[PDB]
Amino acid sequence: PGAAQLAHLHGILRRRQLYCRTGFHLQILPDGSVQGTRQDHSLFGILEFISVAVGLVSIRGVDSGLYLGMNDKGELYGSEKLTSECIFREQFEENWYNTYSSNIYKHGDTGRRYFVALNKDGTPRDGARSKRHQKFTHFLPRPVDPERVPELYKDLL
Amino acid sequence: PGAAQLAHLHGILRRRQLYCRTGFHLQILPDGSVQGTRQDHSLFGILEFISVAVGLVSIRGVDSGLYLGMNDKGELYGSEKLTSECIFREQFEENWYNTYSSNIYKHGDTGRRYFVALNKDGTPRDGARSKRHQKFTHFLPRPVDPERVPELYKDLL
């Protein structure tokens, strides 16, 4: 084909599963909420990673179509349109587990950044109360076996 | 396009990096040898996973073009053509780390299978001397960021 064809396929090559070290895969539901499923290959767990810049990413739910974004008060959510709240800093942490902080939100005084995180029960943790050294913020990007989520792969088809 | 087009692309969607728990990415060199690099996104570290059957896989080096295979005496190597020695049993182990044993080789007496493994210094370990509970055999499948290995992605292009 052509035009936007090249970039579009690569997005599909960049689809991942974000497994949080507390035992959950980050998912972005259609209603706009963000949470964690213990299920491998969840349909909303299939996230497409857009490499914005060096150390920067944007995570779009392939199924929900929404972009992961963190707001003013540290709360995660699914943004229907890209915004400055949707760009996160991707930093290595330990063992291929990355950490993802807001690219615009931090604690004015300490300078400590706000982090994308999930509690041990799976619900979204308050970005501001989450820290780099805590396991709530560790996220291992995982590969997506397309044959396990066919609905999401009828673009090439 | 057509004919074999559908299956071909999916192979590209199933390219992975096999990170061994002892600190290395399994690579398949052109000379036919198998070893481990500490380098993320090594050019020979980019393996295409062929899901043979349930719990079965075949690993082909994208760059070397060779298929990972284990022989009679537990030694890994890069097979130029598929053989019975190239099919491995993929089993979950802990934390998304899988274990890969020979689908035809085991210890006649104990019944303990032969495992794909790398020592802590990175060289290939003897399949027969490797065990499931040992970290030499733990392998975390990782995603491949195409933009980091362009040479290997000129098929779609």
Side-chain angles (χ1 to χ4, degrees), chain A residues 14 16 19 96 144-145 147, chain B residues 14 16 19 143 145 147:
Chain A
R14 300 260 324 200
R16 305 271 180 285
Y19 174 84
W96 303 126
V144 175
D145 292 310
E147 66 279 312
Chain B
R14 293 202 44 160
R16 308 256 178 288
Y19 174 81
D145 291 319
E147 5 75 46

Side-chain angles (χ1 to χ4, degrees), chain B residues 109-111 113-144:
Chain B
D109 52 291
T110 71
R113 306 205 70 73
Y114 282 20
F115 291 78
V116 180
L118 303 200
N119 312 65
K120 300 181 176 181
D121 67 47
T123 59
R125 194 171 179 62
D126 180 307
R129 227 182 67 151
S130 304
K131 308 163 190 182
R132 196 192 307 283
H133 65 272
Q134 309 196 301
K135 285 178 180 178
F136 299 112
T137 77
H138 300 7
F139 293 93
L140 165 59
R142 295 187 59 224
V144 186

Side-chain angles (χ1 to χ4, degrees), chain B residues 85-93 95-111 113-157:
Chain B
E85 302 193 319
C86 288
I87 283 63
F88 295 84
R89 299 186 178 177
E90 176 175 68
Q91 317 220 314
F92 178 82
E93 191 52 40
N95 284 158
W96 300 131
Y97 274 90
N98 305 314
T99 37
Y100 299 104
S101 61
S102 189
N103 189 56
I104 59 183
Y105 299 136
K106 60 163 170 183
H107 290 291
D109 52 291
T110 71
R113 306 205 70 73
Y114 282 20
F115 291 78
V116 180
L118 303 200
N119 312 65
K120 300 181 176 181
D121 67 47
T123 59
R125 194 171 179 62
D126 180 307
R129 227 182 67 151
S130 304
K131 308 163 190 182
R132 196 192 307 283
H133 65 272
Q134 309 196 301
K135 285 178 180 178
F136 299 112
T137 77
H138 300 7
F139 293 93
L140 165 59
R142 295 187 59 224
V144 186
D145 291 319
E147 5 75 46
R148 275 234 42 187
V149 289
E151 306 97 306
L152 299 173
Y153 288 79
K154 303 180 189 304
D155 290 296
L156 32 88
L157 254 192

